Write a protein that binds this DNA or RNA. Structure first.
Ligand SMILES: C[S@@+](CC[C@H](N)C(=O)[O-])C[C@H]1O[C@@H](n2cnc3c(N)ncnc32)[C@H](O)[C@@H]1O
Length: 376
DNA sequence: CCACATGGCTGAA
DNA sequence: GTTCAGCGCATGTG
């Protein structure tokens, strides 16, 4: 009676999707399987392997000769020299393992109907808002569209992914983006999928973080008929609140910021349950100028900049949320963080970068909890 | 017009 | 090429 769930994660990062599925699997009588993934960012790949691998033993290796389109910064492709620098290192073994054991295809431009797995149960993806425009879609979405088009023609309808899940930032629903987002939804309809859009805040899913994200859950229309699946009203869900203090880690050796030069005010709580106070003459960048109270929720963790440097007031002084606490803030576990840290390949700022790019795990648990599969 | 709220990019080193 | 300290406005609601 156990159901094998084959998952394919496009733009996988550190695998919040895989983590969420593994977290709920027992309660659904599911066994989760990697069908494949697409992730080109070296430090995400390393971290994904660290978190999700079982009995992987890193060692110095030659980089597989076809691992050619990868990136050290997540934005730009690595040079021939950079590839040379990875070749014959422990790091190479992580990338080789992702290829061989997780079927990482690395670059979405290299995914086609000849290497895209058949019979995927859950396909996850995303795209930047620009991709809705010409420069008709572009970039990463054009590639997703191309792949769906290709497999539609070569696969039987039953071999196409049963569910699709997009995650995206809130501005996907802005005035300038929403109509063109709707045309993507039309396109998914043309591919044989019925979809529902959810705007969800992490704070309503057992987290101490204000983080509003857009999700488009799609189900293949014949599978909808077969299962009798109905979309759940997730935007009404409100779980009990959680405070920043609930995730903080005790230490005697934190670094505290010297804020003695800056004038401040009382804390104020906004409608969103964020409790903060400004620092005067600190910077000219508004989002850098706040200190957060640990008895409320915090701001959206970003990969870089002001919202990656989240100042909290504690009895011991004002400090940043640490990389460990940032993993906890995204609802990864302490053990997940320890595994990444133990690679000795990912800097503290890079850890925060990958955490900031991820998705709070319990939002995904809630979405995936609604999925229905036939006993076949 | 106002008050308020909220979340990556890049050039010097 | 990397790294991150320094830096502002876009996109809203009311
Ligand atoms: C915001 S993240 C997604 C993070 C992920 N949802 C997680 O659970 O951590 C977007 C990811 O897409 C990756 N990416 C960008 N361009 C890519 C490409 N051409 N091929 C594969 N991955 C790409 C980036 O490296 C980044 O990790």
């Amino acid at each position: 009676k156990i159901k094998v769930i084959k998952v394919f994660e496009a733009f996988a990062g550190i695998g919040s999707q895989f983590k969420a599925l593994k977290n709920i699997a027992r309660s659904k009588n599911w066994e989760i399987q990697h069908s494949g993934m697409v992730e080109w960012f070296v430090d995400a790949i390393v971290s994904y392997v660290a978190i999700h691998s079982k009995n992987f033993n890193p060692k110095i290796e030659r980089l597989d000769r076809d691992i050619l389109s990868i990136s050290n910064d997540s934005k730009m492709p690595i040079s021939e020299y950079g590839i040379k620098k990875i070749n014959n290192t422990i790091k190479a073994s992580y990338l080789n393992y992702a290829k061989k054991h997780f079927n990482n295809l690395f670059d979405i431009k290299k995914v086609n109907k000849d290497n895209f797995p058949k019979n995927i149960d859950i396909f996850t993806y995303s795209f930047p808002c620009q991709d809705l425009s010409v420069q008709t879609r572009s970039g990463l979405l054009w590639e997703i569209e191309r792949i769906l088009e290709e497999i539609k023609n070569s696969f039987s309808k039953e071999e196409m992914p049963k569910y699709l899940l997009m995650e995206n930032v809130k501005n996907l629903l802005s005035h300038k983006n929403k109509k063109n987002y709707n045309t993507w939804l039309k396109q998914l309809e043309k591919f044989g999928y019925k979809s529902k859009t959810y705007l969800l805040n992490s704070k309503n899913f057992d987290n101490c973080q204000n983080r509003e994200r857009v999700f488009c859950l799609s189900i293949r229309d014949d599978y909808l008929e077969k299962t009798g699946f109905k979309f759940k009203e997730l935007e009404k869900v409100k779980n009990p609140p959680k405070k920043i203090k609930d995730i903080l880690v005790d230490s005697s050796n934190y670094k505290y910021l010297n804020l003695n030069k800056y004038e401040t005010t009382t804390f104020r709580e906004t409608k969103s349950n964020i409790i903060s106070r400004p620092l005067k003459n600190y910077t000219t960048f508004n989002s850098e100028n706040y200190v957060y109270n640990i008895n409320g929720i915090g701001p959206t963790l970003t990969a870089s900049g002001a919202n990656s440097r989240i100042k909290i007031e504690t009895q011991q002084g004002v400090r940043y949320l640490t990389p460990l606490e940032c993993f906890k803030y995204m609802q990864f576990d302490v053990n997940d963080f320890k595994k990444v840290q133990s690679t000795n390949l990912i800097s503290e700022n890079k850890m925060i970068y990958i955490a900031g790019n991820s998705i709070p795990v319990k939002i995904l648990e809630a979405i995936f909890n609604t999925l229905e599969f036939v006993n076949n």
